[PDB]
C-alpha cells in the first residue's frame, strides 16, 4: 500500500547556520522520503510567507518550532491515510486546510516540506529515480549551467552597481566537458584576480568571488581574460550571463548607477544594455529593470527580445497569475523558477507548463539558504528544459547538484543529450 | 518543459485512478480542461449512475471553456442515449482541441465519437499514453473485447502447502493486511464465487466488513454439481444485502420447489470435465451484467478454474504456519526472506 | 574509544565465522592476541585435524606474546583429543590475561580449562559477548547439550502447494541460487537423509557439485520401512565418495545377504507411528559421530519429521509455477511481493 | 548473500572544486553502499600516498582517472566475491595487492573509498544504522563539538601567526543546547567583528571568519566578548581551543612569532603557553610544538600534561607505529584521527584502540576538501569518543555532520549521554 503512515518534522540548520524545517514521510509499505526546505522570505505581499517564532531568547528570532508543531499536529492528522501517488490530493488538502492565499496560517516551509517528502516517498515506493518519477520519457536534455563567478553590490562592498556575473559554457558536446571548462575557468579566474593585486581570499554564499573591482567593465574584461587564459575562446565556448536585480537602485523612476554616478531613465537604460549586448558575448539579462516598471519591460522586450534572453525573477515571483498577466501583456521571454516561492510542487509544474506553452524557457533556480538536498537537478533533468542556476564550483551545497548531474549523465549514457547553444531560444 | 501533453495526460490518468473502488461496471475516466496554459477543470467518474467525467468537469466551469483543450483518457460516449452524450457537452462548451488516450474497446462504438467530434471541426488526436490507459482499464477492456468476466483467484496457504486446517482449529491463516486486501477486492469485484463444500464447512457471509465510502456487496454464486440438501441455517439465503445464485447441473424437485419458495434463482448447465460447463457459466455471467468475477476458497473449485486456464490474475496469502496432524497449528517466525526469481524462505521458531 | 574489549571480541567472532563451511564436527573458534594495544596475532579454526585456533595464532609469534592478552571465542580444550592442550601453549607463551566469551558446552568439561589457567596465575574473564558466541555455535552447542544432531528441513514447492511435478516434466522448481544454497547446506551438514520413494522416483546422487575450497560429502542415510527390493542401477551404491546406511525395521534375508556382499551397513530399529523409531535413530546418529543432519525431499519423510517436533530450522524454495493436472508446468511471473507478518504475493502469467 | 557483486568508481568534485574518487559497492542481495574520499596529501614521506594524473591538459594537473581505472580493473577483479561483512579480509587483500608501505601503487584514495563503500553496503545489508553497525552497545556518548571561529596564518593574510581559534560549548546538558550556543555565539561574533571596524567580507574553507586582527590576544578577547554578548558566561559555558600548527614558523630550532616579532626557544614557548593557560579558559593545544622537536614535546607533556589537553596531528599522522613510539616515550595527551591519512578503516580502529588503552582521548577530524558524506559523525558516536572536530557553522559540508548528530541524538533519546565537561580527561 502507498498510503501515508507517518509524517514527522524536525528543526535542522541550513547552509547559513539558520534553523529550517526537515520532514520525513513513511508510507505503509515502508517507503521513506526526506525533504529539507531552503530558507525564503518571511514577509511580503506577493510570495508565500514563511512562519518563524520571533523569539529573541531562541536562536536569534529564527526558531521554526511553530512550523514543526503545525506540521506534527495539523498536517499530520490531515494528510494521514491519503494515497501518496496523488500529489494533487495532498497539495489541495493542505491548501484548503491552511485557508489563506499566501499560506500565512501554516507557513510555506511546512507545506513545501510535506509535499516534497511525499513525492520522494512515492518515487521510492515505485523503485524509480526521482527525475524518472517526475517525467517518464526516453530522451532527456542535460541542463546548461550558469556559474556565478562574480558577486557585486548587494552581496559585498565592491562599489559595483551590478549584482551577479556568471559564465555559461555552451560550446561543448557533453556536460562533462562543460563542467571541466567551468572548473578550469574558475581556477584561472582566481589566479588572474590574484595577479592584478585584488583581494580574493574568501568566498561568497554562492561560491563566487567578491573582489573590490572598480567598475562593471573591469569585471567583464577580467572574466573574458580568465576565459581566454584557460584555453577556451570567448564567444564560442564561454558566454556571459548577467544579474542586475535592478530593484535595489531604482528610486522615483530613476535608475541610479552609483558606480559611474549616473541617473538614467528607462529607454537609455535599455540603450546601455544593448551597447553591452553587441559589446560582449552576453546572453542573459535577469531582472534588468524594476518589477514596478512594466512599460520599460515592454519596451525592453520589444527592442531586445530577439537578441538576448530576458529573465524575470522579482517580476513574476513564480506566480501563475502574474506570469499570465505578463504573457497577455507580452513581457520578457524567460522565467526563473523557485520552489520555495510558491510552496507546492503542483503549482510549480503549472507555472512551468504555462511558460512552456507560452514559448518561454524555464530556468530552475536555487536560494541563498540552501541545504544538502539536490532536488533541483532532478527537476531540471525531468522537465527537459535545459538551463539551471545552481551556483558556482566552490562549496558542497553548490557541488552536490553538479555531482547529481554527472551521475544522471552517466546513467543515461545513450539517452541524455546536451543542447549546448540550441538551448537559448531567442532567435528565429 | 517539453513534454507538456504527456504531463497533462498523466494527471488525467491519476484523476481516473481516483475512482478505483466504486466505478464498476463503468470504466475509469478522467478529464482535464486547459485554457491559456492553466488547468481550470477537474473531473473523474466516481460512482455508477452519476455524471460522467466530462460533464462533471464542464458543469462547474460554466462557459469559460470556450476555446480550451480537453485531455480525456477514454473516447467520449456518443451512442449511449441514457444521458446526453459527452460529445454534445464538449461541442456546446466550445472546446477547440480534444486529445484522447485510447479508443473505445467496443468495435461497434469505436471511432463513432471521434467522427462525430470531427464533423464539428474539433481537432482530435488519439494515441497519447495509450498503453498506460489500456493497462489502467484492464478489467473493462477485457470484458468489452471478450464479453467474459475478469477472473481473480485468491487463496491462503501454510508454509507446507495446506489450505484448510484440521477440525477445531481457529481457522485464521491471514493477518489484517490480508483482510483489508480481501475486502478491497470484494468491493471492486461484481461477483463472489465459492463452492458447496466451503459453504457447508465454513458457513461464510461474502459481504464487506471494512470502511469504504460506498459499500458494494458482490453477487454471490454457489457452485454445486448435485443439489439435494438445502439448510435453513445457511447465511447466504438472506437476500437483504446481495443476490445469491445457485449453479447446478442436476437439481432435485424438492430442492427446486424450496428454492422457488425462497426466491433463489438457479441456473441449469451441462456437465463438462467433472464440473459444470464453466465456459457457458462465464458466457451467461457476461450476458447478464457481471464485469469482474472473484473466486475464493475450495481446493476443488480453485483447481477446476486453474485447469481450464480461465484465471487472469492470482493472489496468495502465505503465513508462517505449519499444518500437520496437530489439532492446533504451530506458529513460526520468519528470519530471512530473499526475494528473487524464486522466493527463498527461512524459519526459526518451531 | 570506550568499548575496546567488545571490539576485539567482535573481531574474534568474525574470524570464527571465517571458517563456517569446513569445520564440522569441530566447533568454530577464533583468536586475537593483543600486546601494547596492537593486534599482533590472528587465528581461526579451519579443517578437521589441523592446528587449533590458539596454536595457529601463537605459532607465528614465538616469543613476542609474553605478557599479552588473549581474546578467544570458546574455552580452550584441556583433555580433549582434537589437539595438544591449548592451555599449555598459552601458559608457555606467557599470556598474562585471557578473556573467554563462553564456557565449553559439555558439562563434564566446562570449568576445567578455566581452573587450569587460573592455577598458573592467569587472569580469566568469562562472559563477554556470550549470547552471540552461543548463537554462532548453535549446531555444536545443541549437539553437545543434547547428544542429538542438529537437523535442517529443506524442500521446494510451487505456488499452489505441490512439491512433486507430474510424471514427465523436467523436475525443476528451483533456480541457481537455490542450487547454491542447497549445496552449501550439503557441505555444512555431516549427513544427508532421503526416503525410499524419493530415491526410486528421482535416483539422486547426494554429492556436492559447486566450486568451493574443500568438498565434504555428507553421509547418506536411506530410510525404508520395508526392504524387499535392491536395484543395481542405484547411484547411492557407489561408495567411492561417501557412505550409505539403510535404516529399516524389517529386512529380507536375500536383501541382507546382498547388502553384506555389497558392503552396505543396515540398521534395524523398532517401528513407531507408521515409521521407524526416529528418536532411537537420532541417538544412534549422535553416538556414532554425526553432528548435523539434513532432510531433503519426500512428503512422507518430511511429514514424519515435522509433526514429531524434531526439526530445528526450515528452508523453503517457492517458485512461480502452477502444478495441477498438466505434464508441463504453467510458468508464472511475480509482479509485486509485500513481505510482512504473512507474505502477500501477486502474479499474472496464466 | 553478502558477497560483493559489483564495484564501480567515478570522478566527482569535492567542496573545493577539485576532482576526487567516489565508489559504489553492490552486494549479491542488492545492498548498496556509496563512499566519497576527501582530498589529502599527494606527496610526503610518512603518510599514505594519493595518486593523481599529473596532466596539464586535464583539470589543472589533478585528475583521478588513474585511481578510478586502478579501482575498476585491479581492485574490482581482486575483491569481487569476498564477504562484505569481513572488513579485515578485504582491507588486507587490498594491502597485499598494492604491495607498498605508503600505498603508492594504487593510491590511498582508491583503497579508502572501496573500504568505506564496503562498510556502508554491509551496514545496509543488516538493516542497521552505520554507528550501530560499527559498535552495537546500549549507551552512547554524543561528541562535544569544537567549532572553528577564527582562521589565521596559512588560511589568510592577516598577520596572525596562529592558525585556528575555536570555541567549545561544554557547559550544557544536551547537544541541542550546545549547538544553539554555537549558532548564537557565531552570529554575535560576526556582529562584534563588524562593530569594531573589521572586514568580514566572505567566509573561509572551514566556515570560519578570517578578519584582519592585529594579534592573537585581540582574537581571544574578541571571542570572549562574543561569548559574553551572546548571553553565556566564558569559563562555565564556552571554553577556547587552539590550533597553532607551529611547524610553519619553526626554522633552525627557533619558534618565530612574526606577529610580535620574537624568536623563542622551546622552554620559553611552553612558558608562553602556560601564561595563556591560566590567562584564559583554554583547554586544547593542538600541534603546539613542531613534529621534529620531540624533546620539547616531552617537556611540554611533563609540565603542562595535567592542566590542558595536548593534541598531536602532524606528530602522529594517524600512524600506529609513531603513536606507539610516542606512548613509550610519554609524549602528548591526545590524538587527532583522520581516515584518509592511513587509508583503511581497520587501521583507524587499531589506532584509536591503542589510544584508548594508553589513556589518551581521541578526536575525530575533518579535512579541507570535504564531501557531502557524513562518515565522521557516525564514527564519533559509534566509538564513544567525547570529542569531534568537524568545522564551523557556515557551509553544508560542515553543517551536514551537525544535522546527522541531531538526528542521532533524537533517535537515541533515552540512551544518548552528553559528557559536557567530563569529556576532557586531563585532571585526576
Residue numbers in the entry:
A (entry chain C), D (entry chain A): 2 to 429
B (entry chain B), C (entry chain D): 1 to 350
Could you pull the original sentences from the published paper?
In this study, we have determined the atomic structure of, and identified the chemical compositions and interactions within, a native RibD-enolase protein complex from Francisella novicida. RibD is a key enzyme in this pathway, responsible for two sequential reactions: the deamination of 2,5-diamino-6-ribosyl-amino-4(3H) pyrimidinedione 5′-phosphate and the subsequent reduction of 5-amino-6-ribosylamino-2,4(1H,3H)-pyrimidinedione 5′-phosphate. Enolase catalyzes the conversion of 2-phospho-d-glycerate to phosphoenolpyruvate (PEP) in glycolysis and the reverse reaction in gluconeogenesis. The cryoEM structure reveals a heterotetrametric complex consisting of a RibD dimer and an enolase dimer, in a dimer-of-dimer configuration.
Approximately 5% of the particles from the 2D classification, which displayed C2 symmetry distinct from the dominant population (the overexpressed target protein—T6SS effector), were selected and refined, yielding a 3.05 Å cryoEM map. The RibD dimer adopts a roof-like conformation, sheltering, and interacting with the enolase dimer to form a closed ring, with overall dimensions of 105 Å × 110 Å × 50 Å. RibD is a bifunctional enzyme with deaminase and reductase activities, comprising an N-terminal deaminase domain (1–146) and a C-terminal reductase domain (150–350), connected by a linker region. Enolase consists of an N-terminal domain (1–135) with an antiparallel β-sheet of three strands and four α-helices and a C-terminal domain (141–429) with a mixed α/β-barrel. The deaminase domain of RibD interacts with enolase, forming a key interface within the complex. The N-terminus of RibD helix α1 inserts into a hydrophobic groove on enolase, primarily formed by residues F350, A354, M136, M353, T384, and C363. RibD residues M1, N3, I4, Y7, and Y8 establish extensive hydrophobic contacts, while electrostatic interactions between RibD (R18, E42) and enolase (D87, R89) further stabilize the complex. The RibD homodimer is stabilized by its reductase domains, where two swapped β-sheets form the primary interaction interface. In this study, we show that the Francisella enolase dimer exhibits an extensive interaction interface, burying a solvent-inaccessible surface area of ∼ 3,200 Å2. Thus, despite the physical association between RibD and enolase, enzymatic assays indicated that their catalytic activities are independent of each other.
